[PDB]
Design a protein around this ligand. Structure first.
Ligand SMILES: *[C@@H]1O[C@H](CO)[C@@H](O[C@@H]2O[C@H](CO)[C@@H](O[C@@H]3O[C@H](CO[C@H]4O[C@H](CO)[C@@H](O)[C@H](O)[C@@H]4O)[C@@H](O)[C@H](O)[C@@H]3O)[C@H](O)[C@H]2NC(C)=O)[C@H](O)[C@H]1NC(C)=O
Ligand SMILES: *[C@@H]1O[C@H](CO)[C@@H](O[C@@H]2O[C@H](CO)[C@@H](O[C@@H]3O[C@H](CO)[C@@H](O)[C@H](O)[C@@H]3O)[C@H](O)[C@H]2NC(C)=O)[C@H](O)[C@H]1NC(C)=O
Ligand SMILES: *[C@@H]1O[C@H](CO)[C@@H](O[C@@H]2O[C@H](CO)[C@@H](O)[C@H](O)[C@H]2NC(C)=O)[C@H](O)[C@H]1NC(C)=O
Lengths: 97, 315, 97, 53, 49, 53
């Protein structure tokens, strides 16, 4: 929809096809003026930028720290980690010593 | 250097466009008609495109103190120290190149660009612009502090190197002028001011205008007659306020300087709040110099995030 | 953000043209009849109401979508990787798995 | 522009600056239904009253 | 307390002893700059005023 | 008069200091680096200390 996030969409940065729905309108020029009048919906990207608010880093549960490159959640404190151990003889010590 | 970077413009020409508000409350035809303001910088820099070309003289060479523009038919001169940008106060200009000006502007509701004309007049163009830059980081500061931390941002590089971003260029259209005519008995004269002048007369022969001065036999006098200058050797920018000469592909090609580059900006660091520990209570003294964002969340299964912008002392 | 490209309008002085649809995202084309534009030196066209102006406008990907853009993703099958220190007996090592 | 004061000054023959400041509520009412500050390049015409020059 | 009335106190105008609790803090200077960075609580007297 | 009141400065010198914001958005080394601004006046007057004399 025009005026919201996703008003124009492109599949890839190297995409050749671009989808645009911005409700562009054309109207008569005034008498004795060359100005190409047009009225168009403002970009939804800037609207999202100044209406995004806080990101997932500020609301993630369990104290997760959200980073990008690549998108990840680190040091989340939830669940258990089962451990299976294979210790050789060399590590242990005899009861005689 | 700057010379092999400005040589791209000599093949171009400034233009006169229709500005709807030239400082005062009325339109006129000014050489600083603002076309488009670009705001892709996270640090608050904005780019202004004007009709006049800054840094190029009458011949086409590069100087750091001359602005060339259109006043009627002939190109003329202007000085650079008088270019100013106004939103609510005075803006800090960081770099100018041809049609493009980048400047640091306070928050404002309008964008006025003016220079001192060669006729000692002041020529301006005013447009409406929401200049409300988003904060860089979490403090709403206006002056760069002398200590703090560095936060990444995007900025326009202050270089004149050519970039992938460019603007369309094309041949100027026919430029009519009523004063190029004088009424004479029989042979109406069309003063040939310029290189090539085109005419078409209902009572007279009309047809093509060719060049040079001609004495056209007709009793139509000034009426049923008018002339336009054509075959401009230089090029115009395809501005929305100037008619297109023809439905052909563009002719010239000019890049947009000051590309967006990765950078970082110093940001202020707020004072550490004063914390008194209550029994599973947390009370903080907040002393912001400016609107400061306070944020907390629970570290458990169900967080309860908070938001409030702090502008005064609060508890 | 998008970019509305509005080329200079073609003003057909004492003549008439037709709109030609093109393959452009959000393309608009309009032929306005009876136009009498003015320039600084005077009237651009020759007749009174016998003139057309061609208005053409379209939406294009901005020059800095390559730089300033937001990506929409779908997240599924999160893969967990952790850093563990093992220090037993006389050894003290750290590995990631 | 909208403001709280009205100052008028000229440069004196003694190269001095001579001014006079007064308090004035300059908050002009909107013309029509949009609170604009800059005259646009296209739109519609709405009647109003003005001082002839 | 810093930031409130009475952050600094003096018994008399001719007093030599002065009590001050303004939570003054000192921090590393930035690289290549001589500026003595410090962050301190604003005066509680002006706040009271 | 003003002369026996300004004679105290001759024995002093102006200095160049680090100003973090010199009009534009960047620091440089200017002779008007503001040090302290004082507002002990009830009528709204403020005192500005600058590097230059
Ligand atoms: C500001 O600096 C940014 C960081 O250097 C610049 O963004 C980088 O721009 C380059 C060139 O356009 C992008 O390169 C593309 O990379 C993709 C693959 O995406 C990335 O993901 C893979 C894993 O799947 C990872 O291994 C790499 O990070 C990949 O690059 C390629 O397929 C494309 O061909 C192209 O090489 C970078 O992705 C991009 N970095 C980031 C983190 O976005 C930015 O252009 C600079 N802006 C300026 C100059 O103002
Ligand atoms: C040079 O000027 C002549 C006049 O000196 C221009 O002639 C004008 O041509 C237009 C053609 O559109 C005529 O307008 C109209 O023609 C349409 C045809 O569909 C008709 O429907 C209207 O009734 C109207 O006549 C116009 O009458 C005509 N004026 C004349 C012949 O006096 C001519 O276009 C110009 N050529 C150049 C150099 O552009
Ligand atoms: C094993 O050795 C590592 C690396 O030397 C120790 O890591 C450091 O431990 C001491 C404090 O105990 C400090 O030098 C640093 O604070 C630690 N660095 C870190 C945490 O990366 C580690 O503690 C040792 N572990 C043992 C012996 O249990």
């Amino acid at each position: 929809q025009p005026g919201r996030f996703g008003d124009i969409q492109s599949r890839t940065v190297e995409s050749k096809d671009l989808y645009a729905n911005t409700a562009l309108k054309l109207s008569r020029p005034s008498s004795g003026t060359v100005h190409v009048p047009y009225t168009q919906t403002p970009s939804g990207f800037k609207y999202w930028l100044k209406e995004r608010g806080t990101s997932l880093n500020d609301k993630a549960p369990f104290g997760c720290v959200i980073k990008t490159n690549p998108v990840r959640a680190e040091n989340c404190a939830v669940g258990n980690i089962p451990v299976s151990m294979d210790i050789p003889d060399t590590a242990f010590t005899r009861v005689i010593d | 250097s700057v010379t092999e970077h400005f040589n791209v413009y000599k093949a171009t020409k400034p233009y006169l466009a229709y500005c709807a508000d030239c400082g005062d409350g009325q339109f006129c035809y000014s050489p600083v008609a603002i076309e488009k303001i670009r705001d892709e910088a996270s640090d608050g820099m904005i780019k202004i495109q004007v009709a006049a070309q800054i840094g190029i003289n009458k011949g086409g060479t590069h100087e750091h103190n001359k602005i060339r523009y259109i006043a009627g038919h002939d190109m003329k001169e202007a000085n650079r120290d008088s270019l100013q940008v106004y939103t609510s106060g005075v803006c800090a200009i960081r770099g100018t190149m041809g049609h493009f000006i980048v400047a640091y502007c306070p928050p404002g509701d309008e964008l006025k660009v003016q220079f001192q004309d060669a006729e000692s007049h002041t020529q301006a163009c005013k447009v409406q612009y929401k200049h409300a830059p988003a904060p860089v980081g979490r403090e709403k500061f206006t002056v760069r502090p002398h200590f703090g931390i560095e936060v990444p941002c995007t900025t326009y590089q202050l270089t004149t190197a050519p970039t992938e971003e460019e603007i369309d260029m094309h041949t100027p259209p026919d430029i009519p002028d009523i004063t190029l005519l004088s009424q004479q008995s029989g042979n109406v004269k069309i003063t040939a001011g310029g290189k090539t002048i085109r005419y078409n007369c209902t009572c007279g022969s009309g047809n093509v205008g060719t060049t040079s001065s001609d004495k056209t036999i007709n009793s139509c006098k000034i009426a049923q007659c008018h002339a336009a200058v054509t075959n401009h050797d230089k090029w115009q920018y395809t501005s929305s306020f100037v008619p297109r000469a023809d439905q052909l592909s563009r002719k010239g090609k000019v890049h947009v300087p000051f590309p967006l580059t990765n950078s970082t900006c110093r940001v202020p660091v707020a004072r550490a709040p004063g914390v008194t520990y209550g029994k599973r209570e947390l009370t903080v003294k907040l002393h912001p110099d400016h609107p400061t964002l306070l944020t907390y969340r629970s570290l458990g299964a169900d967080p309860r995030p908070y938001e409030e912008w702090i502008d005064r002392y609060v508890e | 953000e998008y970019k509305t490209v509005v080329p200079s309008p073609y003003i057909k002085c004492c003549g008439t043209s037709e709109c030609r649809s093109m393959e452009r995202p959000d393309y608009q084309c309009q032929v306005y009849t009876g136009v009498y534009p003015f320039m600084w030196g005077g009237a651009y066209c020759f007749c009174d109401t016998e003139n057309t102006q061609l208005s053409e406008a379209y939406v294009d990907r901005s020059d800095v979508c390559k730089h300033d853009h937001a990506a929409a993703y779908k997240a599924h099958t999160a893969a967990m990787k952790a850093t563990i220190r093992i220090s037993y007996g006389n050894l003290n090592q750290t590995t990631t798995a």
